[PDB]
């Protein structure tokens, strides 16, 4: 659920900072061009906000958890 969620942002090489609030998944990338809008939304996202250089994936309560699942897909 999270290994394909890191690819939806481009990949460990494009995600500069992985973060998440209560219901969103505010992740800051290096290149928005590489952000997969479909895959994110076809994985649970109710909307993808691309304000500037930071994406905000709308998944819900699973967000606070998903940010953790994606950080483990490095180690």
């Amino acid at each position: 659920m999270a290994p394909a969620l890191v690819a939806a942002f481009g990949g460990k090489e494009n995600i500069t900072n992985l973060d998440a609030c209560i219901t969103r998944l505010r992740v800051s990338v290096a290149d928005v061009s590489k952000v997969d809008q479909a895959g994110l939304k076809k994985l649970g996202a109710a909307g993808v906000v691309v304000a500037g250089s930071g994406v905000q994936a709308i998944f819900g309560t699973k967000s606070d958890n998903l940010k953790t699942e994606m950080d483990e897909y490095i180690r």
Binding site: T23, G52, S53
Partner: protein, 380 residues
């Protein structure tokens, strides 16, 4: 649906009077213990409201991008749903460039976002206020007063696609009208009429506490009501419009053309500026005076018919011309009272807006109230 209008109506309540218990929401908002208690339950689980018997609103982590396009400048700022200010920009816009405008506006917004990429806590929507004829439904600016290049601009569709949040198109005038009612001069009033008199002419109206919209949310183009059947062409395609006679530029253009002829004016020496005209109209100059009077008389006649339609409490003027208020105001009132249902005009007073230079606020709160933005915010 009914879910959107029923959901946004409980929110509309919880913010107008904080706090209010699940009982006042069921009662004051006309709703059963099932469709008034559970409607808050999902708003609490989405943090649009706050706990503590009493229910208030949570508006700090929610933000929205607001921007205004002036005759030549793009102002930016992020705000809470309470309309508080987080950060504001001052980027120049200019007229001609390599790229059109729509693409230029996008870069501007994108810039604003990378710098202040740490202030943002959660984006809900974006609200723009610019001049010209607009479709709003699709947000297609047709034509504009200072960018003859702009022809059918999908600003609404484009800015949404480039972010993922709803776009709100409105005029600098409407927005400012709600602002005056929220902290300006009409704060506390239920029926106001606000006229703007700058590079664009227009008027925002507040009916029974609500900001008057138009048919299909099409905006009030009161500035395009013909006042002179022989006047000059207007970007709306018509001619003789109000925006064509009372537009500050036209005033000076009319003064300037009449100066270029056989005429006297304590304005011959000092070059013509919006300040210099009033400053000279007050000293008694037959020219500057009569230009403003007329200006006043042209806005008053229209404003007289609006008095008969809305019978407002307060009438506000927002213009650099309010420097020569003792010539303007007294004329607009004289036009109001001589051609409007007395009982309506015999307890009305023209006063100047106590603010200058806006920001969505009205379109974003109302976006919450209608429940449109609320439903999309309930999953986020």
């Amino acid at each position: 649906q009914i879910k959107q209008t029923n959901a946004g109506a409980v929110y509309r309540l919880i913010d107008q009077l904080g706090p209010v218990s699940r009982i006042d929401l069921s009662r004051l908002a006309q709703l059963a213990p099932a469709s008034i208690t559970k409607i808050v339950r999902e708003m609490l689980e989405a943090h649009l409201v706050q706990e503590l018997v009493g229910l208030v609103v949570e508006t700090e982590a929610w933000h929205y991008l607001s921007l205004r396009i002036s005759r030549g400048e793009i102002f930016l700022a992020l705000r809470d749903l309470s309309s508080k200010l987080v950060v504001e920009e001052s980027q120049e816009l200019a007229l001609k460039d390599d790229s059109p405008l729509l693409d230029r506006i996008i870069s501007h917004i994108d810039q604003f976002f990378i710098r202040h990429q740490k202030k943002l806590e959660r984006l809900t929507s974006i609200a723009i206020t610019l001049p010209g004829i607009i479709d709003t439904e699709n947000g297609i600016v047709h034509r504009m007063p200072f960018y003859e290049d702009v022809k059918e601009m999908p600003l609404g569709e484009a800015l949404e696609q480039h972010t993922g949040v709803p776009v709100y198109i409105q005029h600098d005038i409407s927005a400012w009208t709600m602002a005056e009612a929220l902290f300006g001069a009409s704060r506390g009033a239920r029926d106001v009429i606000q006229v703007v008199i700058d590079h664009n002419v227009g008027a925002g109206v507040i009916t029974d506490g609500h900001l008057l919209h138009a048919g299909s949310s099409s905006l009030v183009e009161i500035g395009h009501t013909q006042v002179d059947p022989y006047g000059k062409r207007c970007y709306c395609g018509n001619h003789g419009c109000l925006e064509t006679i009372a537009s500050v530029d036209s005033i000076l253009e009319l003064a300037q053309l009449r100066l270029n002829q056989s005429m006297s004016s304590m304005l011959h020496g000092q070059p013509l500026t919006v300040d210099s005209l009033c400053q000279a109209a007050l000293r008694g100059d037959l020219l500057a005076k009569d230009i403003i009077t007329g200006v006043g008389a042209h806005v008053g006649r229209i404003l007289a018919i609006m008095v008969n339609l809305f019978n407002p409490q307060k009438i506000l003027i927002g213009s650099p011309l309010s420097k020569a208020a003792d010539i303007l105001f007294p004329v607009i009132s004289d036009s109001i009272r001589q051609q409007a249902l007395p009982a309506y005009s015999q307890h009305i007073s023209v006063e100047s807006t106590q603010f200058s230079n806006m920001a969505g606020a009205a379109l974003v709160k109302d976006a919450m109230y209608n429940g449109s933005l609320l439903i999309r915010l309930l999953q986020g």
